[PDB]
Write a protein that binds this ligand. Structure first.
Ligand code: ZN
Ligand code: ZN
Ligand code: ZN
Ligand code: ZN
Lengths: 101, 101, 101, 101
């Protein structure tokens, strides 16, 4: 059930390998990062995730706190996939809301 | 001043008697050990240290490898103290790097 | 002793967090990639290491085979640190031995 | 058909009879198990499959979570075969671009 640091290590590796676009998208939307070229997960725990975010001339580490705490490892992948969808939707709505002085 | 079995014993005794919180921190942070009941140094050598950890009634030996070989015995205490500061400081974000879903 | 998949993951995670510039360097010199923005270790085993390299173009996986197989897991770090030195020291002699046609 | 425990029983049974080398391959690659004697599927459900893995020493149960939940309208025999291919394929990407120190 609970999220051992070894399962965090495995979740992060899986997401870095097979969902690098979802992580850039987390960093862009929840991370409010701009000209994000790439992003990797470094840790996940029940309250949030550590992302390393590369811009066109440097890198930083950000934290994204979850609205809901992560109960069980067995859910983490379905929740991260749902956050990637939610992030798609919120990025779409924001990009639409451009006004000019 | 090469590190010997004798010196190792004494370093371990000192850290166990006087720096018990530091060893738990090592096990928790570097060793990724969760719900840890006891942690003690068993041995130290130039390249690393061996820890015995009780998590759930059961015990294992974990090894933490140093980023750098210890030059000599006289460096051990100052490296272990610094390593306890280093461990207290993993996770920590600039603040400007904290966001929310 | 034996380099396990679990230890591979730990070495790669360490190298990606503490030595990212070293891995970019491996991709550059050992991996003859010239355009390299960044690079992550994906796996390490006794005979070599697997890298994801990002060029402006995009991403690719490469493998670098060690000259001598890793004797064990505890040798990995000192071998990687030495390879980073090997790698930084390729543009050497030529520096003082410039001649003109 | 949707995955009832009676359906799991027949899928596992066939895999365990006709595809034991695939089940061992799941456990070695996906499951990161080494020195595996053999391995059996004990159960499969929309989100993953439970394997029993035996090593020289003893046995252990692992779970492998599917990228996509199974939709029943998609077969599983064919899906597990795809997973068998994808497992042999892991590493092959990187080992195609082999370099030497
Ligand atoms: Zn002291
Ligand atoms: Zn290091
Ligand atoms: Zn079949
Ligand atoms: Zn996935």
């Amino acid at each position: 059930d609970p999220l051992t640091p070894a399962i965090s290590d495995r979740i992060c590796k899986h997401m870095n390998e097979d969902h690098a676009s979802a992580i850039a998208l987390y960093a862009q939307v929840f991370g409010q990062q701009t000209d994000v070229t790439m992003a990797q997960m470094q840790a996940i725990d029940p309250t949030g995730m550590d992302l390393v975010v590369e811009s066109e001339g440097g890198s930083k580490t950000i934290r994204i706190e979850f609205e809901q705490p992560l109960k069980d490892s067995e859910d983490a992948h379905q929740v991260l996939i749902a956050m990637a969808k939610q992030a798609r939707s919120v990025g779409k709505n924001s990009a639409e809301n451009l006004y000019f002085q």
